[PDB]
Structures are given as structure tokens and as C-alpha cells.
Amino acid sequence: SYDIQAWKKQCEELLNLIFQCEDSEPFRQPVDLLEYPDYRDIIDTPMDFATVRETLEAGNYESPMELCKDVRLIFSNSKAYTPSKRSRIYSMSLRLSAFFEEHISSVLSDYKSALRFHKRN
Numbered sequence: 515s516y517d518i519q520a521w522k523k524q525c526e527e528l529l530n531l532i533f534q535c536e537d538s539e540p541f542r543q544p545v546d547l548l549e550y551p552d553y554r555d556i557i558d559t560p561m562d563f564a565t566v567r568e569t570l571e572a573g574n575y576e577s578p579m580e581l582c583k584d585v586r587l588i589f590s591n592s593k594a595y596t597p598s599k600r601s602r603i604y605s606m607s608l609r610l611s612a613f614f615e616e617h618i619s620s621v622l623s624d625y626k627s628a629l630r631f632h633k634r635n
């Protein structure tokens with residue numbers, strides 16, 4: 515497909531699948547500072563899947579690369595806030611990251627291919 519717009523619905527569907535994963539539940543809404551009072555000492559830019567979905571639905575992503583950067587920030591924040599690489603919530607992040615990367619690969623490839631076809635002449 516050379517459809518330059520198709521990534522948006524493909525990302526909406528992938529976010530729906532991520533919301534059906536039990537592994538996403540800790541990453542759905544902005545982190546709880548009352549539970550994790552040091553969190554914002556450690557993490558410069560909070561990110562969560564509800565923020566990503568709202569940004570997409572507002573029309574405030576230009577490309578699936580930008581959405582991918584925010585989703586990867588959810589996972590780097592978990593890797594950097596975790597007190598242990600054997601932690602429950604951290605291990606949930608690693609499985610969910612593998613699922614996300616498996617699905618986003620085609621979305622990025624198709625978008626970049628569509629843009630190259632648009633600029634072919």
C-alpha cells in the first residue's frame with residue numbers, strides 16, 4: 515500500500531491490542547507519585563499509553579516514528595525507574611516492548627515506503 519495516512523488507524527488498532535494485554539495495566543495512565551514519591555527525581559519525561567492514544571486522537575502526531583518514540587519512552591522510563599532488572603513491573607515492560615516492536619515494524623516500513631513513492635518524481 516502507498517497510503518501515506520494508513521499508519522494512524524494501524525496505530526489505533528495496535529494501541530487497542532496493547533490495552534487488552536494484562537502486561538500494559540501499569541503503563542496505561544500517568545505514574546502514581548503518591549506510591550512512588552522519588553519517581554520524578556529519576557524520570558525527566560513521564561509517558562503512558564493513555565497519553566499516546568490521546569496525542570494520536572488529537573491529531574498531534576505527524577508520523578508513526580513520533581508515536582514510536584513516545585512508546586519507547588514508556589519502556590526506557592521503566593528500565594530507568596526499576597530498582598531491579600528482576601522486578602515484576604519491569605519484566606511486564608520487556609514482554610510488552612517485544613510485542614510492540616513485532617507489530618510496529620510493518621507500520622513504519624509501509625509509511626516510509628509510501629512517502630518515498632510520493633517523492634518518486
Ligand SMILES: O=C(Nc1ccon1)N1CCN(C(=O)c2ccco2)CC1
Pocket residue numbers: 539540541542543544545546549550591592593595596597601603604
Ligand atoms: O505506578 C505505576 N503505574 C501506575 C500508577 C497508577 O496508574 N499506573 N507504575 C508503573 C511504572 N513504573 C515502573 O515502570 C516500575 C519499574 C519498577 C517498578 O515500577 C512505576 C510504577
